[PDB]
Amino acid sequence: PPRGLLARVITNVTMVILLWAVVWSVTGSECLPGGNLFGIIMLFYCAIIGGKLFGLIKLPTLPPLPPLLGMLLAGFLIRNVPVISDNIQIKHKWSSALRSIALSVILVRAGLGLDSNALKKLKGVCVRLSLGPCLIEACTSAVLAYFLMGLPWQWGFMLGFVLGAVSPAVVVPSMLLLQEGGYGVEKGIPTLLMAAGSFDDILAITGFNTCLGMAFFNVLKGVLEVIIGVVTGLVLGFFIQYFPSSDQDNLVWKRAFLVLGLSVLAVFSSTYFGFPGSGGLCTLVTAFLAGRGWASTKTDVEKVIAVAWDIFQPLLFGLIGAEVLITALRPETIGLCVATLGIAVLIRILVTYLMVCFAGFNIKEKIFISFAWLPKATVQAAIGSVALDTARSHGEKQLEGYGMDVLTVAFLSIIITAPVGSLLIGLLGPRLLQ
Amino acid sequence: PPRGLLARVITNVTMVILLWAVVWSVTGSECLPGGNLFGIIMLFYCAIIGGKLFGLIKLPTLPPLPPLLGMLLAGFLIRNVPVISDNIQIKHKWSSALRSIALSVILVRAGLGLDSNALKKLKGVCVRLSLGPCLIEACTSAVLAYFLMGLPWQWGFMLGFVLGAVSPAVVVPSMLLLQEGGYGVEKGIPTLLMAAGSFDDILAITGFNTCLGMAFFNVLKGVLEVIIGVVTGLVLGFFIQYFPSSDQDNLVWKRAFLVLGLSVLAVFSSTYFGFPGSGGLCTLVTAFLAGRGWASTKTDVEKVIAVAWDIFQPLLFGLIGAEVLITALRPETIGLCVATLGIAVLIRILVTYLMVCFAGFNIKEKIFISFAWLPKATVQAAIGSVALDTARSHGEKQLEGYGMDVLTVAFLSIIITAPVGSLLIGLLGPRLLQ
């Protein structure tokens, strides 16, 4: 009599090797332990098992253990071991492309899940929260960094823009899960945070690019990117609410690919044209415009996108933590960098609390919004790599040394504020605004 | 208001180009019109539309037009036009690999649909039908060709083996439709023809290889191929009836994928090792062992394999008909080749009729069996291409001319007897054994 315990494993093993051989025939060395495709699958599995372990094995009693910490730790262990990192290697273009795709997935889901009429009721708070804390934190961090490390204003201002950048990837999943359940009456608070933390990305890169050029105009170029992004999103919006009608079938599957596929294509086309970052605004506008014109087909396509986002979630964080090979063990008095990021994070809490004292937020809503700007994600990692690449083209040792310090504080910030911030908002949601 | 008729096409077009752009990013090449992957998709679509046109627009009134004729014409047009020959091209390695995969699909489906206890009731007639008419037809064709074309016995014997060959790639779909429909009482007649005309490929290639070596031992090697195939099939048979059990879930998809993958792996492993054709019998034995196990999910997985076979059927015919550019317009007294082909077909009818006069087949069954061995398939094309490759390595003008003549008659035979034979058996099914 066959045994189910000894038959499930055998069947799965045979299926895996059979599928492995098929891809090996069409690719070759990629499926070999040393290759790109093999590394992506192994990194995907490593991130999956890391998330499961962090939350089901050693989870804390009262606060559930978020999988974000496990994903970053899994990527850190993979890259920071020469024998392990030898087999799994990923090209820079694939890492950048996967980052752009995953970032587009979380943005379109936020726009699709955003509630209408929220902008009309309160738009000033969203604009002030998008511009206010980002500029104040960058200035305060630059001043705090100045006269402490010795680097000039060109490096100080550049570090401030990189350090202050709210990341949609780490906040949107928290808001949508909270919004689906809901505590009390959600008066647009989840929509306010989701929309506000999107325009920040454009300003952060625009300031970073302009400041980088000074260390080597672009201010007007960034404005054109915002204008183009709105126009491109608006044009694509009318072609998703009109061509797909009730006459067509398979509405759930057909239109989910359409909105997601155009979102990915828009970002790559904008980046290839010469003005990156306009795609991030285009997908949000396209998703918001589509929701305006959907025939109550919101939750139908939300489930498909949610599954797609859940797939890319381990993949996105795995790439972020798998690029710390250079500074694996380089003790260079990192305590000073901790103080610089810690003060700026502390200032970030205070300024965000101040900006939400106008109306509506009486007592508890101020605290939740202030703590919702803690986590950081790929946005810092992408610009940080670009700064290193520009530095290591015609720069001498001093420029290389300064660039290394920027990487250390930027990587450390993602290690600290991302899992703690995501964990804090998860447990404080049912404990602050219920 | 949007119009569904004018929007469905637009939605489909946008989806296709968006999906096409995704492949462009993943694959650095093969996406342009000059790529081989683009040609595969075009050939697949051209064969699909060709089959639909031949049978739904200009179909004859009483006899339905089979799609086999349309597939051959569609492939012929693509290759036989100079401006449509260089823009779209397909490499030889992919064509050879796809032929083996398509051949494996029809073999496993034929074995799965085979009726149990059919071999035990009458196996002598199956062996005689497999060996008798095939060898006699090859000998008669060589003698008939001799004293007519002037080629020596080395070329005459090789032509006879290539000309005389029964392939299940065409007859099995006709038999399965007959089995599914049912007329009167089916005493294993469809299964008898499928089983007898399944392992004849091994004998055909063994004779071709033996004759090629003499024209440049193999008999002993061919016997070993049969022995290895039976042993591999027997061992693999117990691994599909035991490991996949009712305890697991999604048996329909899991078992169908498992048998398809193992069949492909066995054929590729045998071909790469140095003895091609052994995997052809191995999948038949493996399917027979799976059929004898009686998993009770035959019809559940037959539909899935039938859909897969229906997908690969235009692809297999498209590759065969896309290698006729060499002999597009070469008038070299082809009437003699037609006469030799007609006599060989006439000889095949007589010998097949003689071998089915033992028992059971009273009047109508003899006619059906004789007409069931007329259609031919890729078996001739594969060996014919090998003969051309061997000829064009150290051969002079006379050998080159002889090799071209062998291809012309072989290509002509496939063009004639395959669609006419398939059409003839299709209309005679409900009119002979009713």
Author numbering:
A (entry chain A), B (entry chain B): 78 to 293, 300 to 517
How does the study describe this entry?
The Na+/H+ exchanger SLC9B2, also known as NHA2, correlates with the long-sought-after Na+/Li+ exchanger linked to the pathogenesis of diabetes mellitus and essential hypertension in humans. Here we report the cryo-EM structures of bison NHA2 in detergent and in nanodiscs, at 3.0 and 3.5 Å resolution, respectively. NHA2 consists of 14 transmembrane (TM) segments, rather than the 13 TMs previously observed in mammalian Na+/H+ exchangers (NHEs) and related bacterial antiporters. The additional N-terminal helix in NHA2 forms a unique homodimer interface with a large intracellular gap between the protomers, which closes in the presence of phosphoinositol lipids.
The bison NHA2 construct used for structural studies is referred to as NHA2ΔN, because it does not include the first 69 residues of the N-terminal tail. The bison NHA2ΔN sample preparation was subsequently optimized for grid preparation, cryo-EM data acquisition and structural determination at pH 8.0. The final cryo-EM map of NHA2ΔN in detergent was estimated at 3.0 Å (Fourier shell correlation (FSC) = 0.143 criterion), although protomer A was consistently better aligned than protomer B, and was therefore resolved at a higher resolution. Overall, the structure of NHA2ΔN in detergent has a model resolution at 4.2 Å (FSC = 0.5), which is reflected in the fact that some side chains in the core domain and the connecting TM6–TM7 loop could not be modeled, probably due to flexibility. The observed additional N-terminal helix TM –1 is part of the dimer domain in NHA2ΔN and is domain-swapped, mediating homodimerization by interacting with TM8 and the TM8–TM9 loop in the neighboring protomer. As a result of the tilted angle of TM –1 and the length of the connecting loop to TM1, the NHA2ΔN protomers are held apart by ~ 25 Å on the intracellular side. In NHA2ΔN, the dimerization contacts are small, made up solely from interactions between TM −1 in one protomer and TM8 in the other. Although NHA2ΔN homodimerization appears very different to any Na+/H+ exchanger observed so far, the NHA2ΔN monomer has a high degree of structural conservation with the outward-facing monomer of NapA, but with the additional TM −1 helix. Dynamic elastic modeling of the nanodisc NHA2ΔN structure shows that TM −1 is indeed flexible and can spontaneously adopt the position seen in the detergent structure.
